[PDB]
Amino acid sequence: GSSGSSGLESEEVDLNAGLHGNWTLENAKARLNQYFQKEKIQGEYKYTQVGPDHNRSFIAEMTIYIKQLGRRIFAREHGSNKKLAAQSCALSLVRQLYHLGVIEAYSSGPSSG
DSSP states (O other): OOOOOOOOOOOOOOOSSSHHHHOOHHHHHHHHHHHHHHHHOOOOOEEESSSSSSSSSHHHHHHEETTTTEEEEEEEEEOOHHHHHHHHHHHHHHEEEEEEEEOOOOOOSSSSO
């Protein structure tokens, strides 16, 4: 086996951006899916249609449990489309994850400054 790899950039550090956290509805979303892909975990979103047709909304709610923490975080937003709602939902869990101490600030690009 042995295995090998190349292309390591150990020259990427931030100052405040490291505290702020580059977690965009988009990132969070993907990230979420990423977390489920890496860990191989399984988690979906629960879209609940409310209001009238003319003006309805799909409440995208999602819940995940962290064993490394011993607890679980739940989310329930009311975005526009499955995508939106979902996104918000994700970011919801993401924000929490980063709060509890599961994920870590993002490095979307070589910092911004």
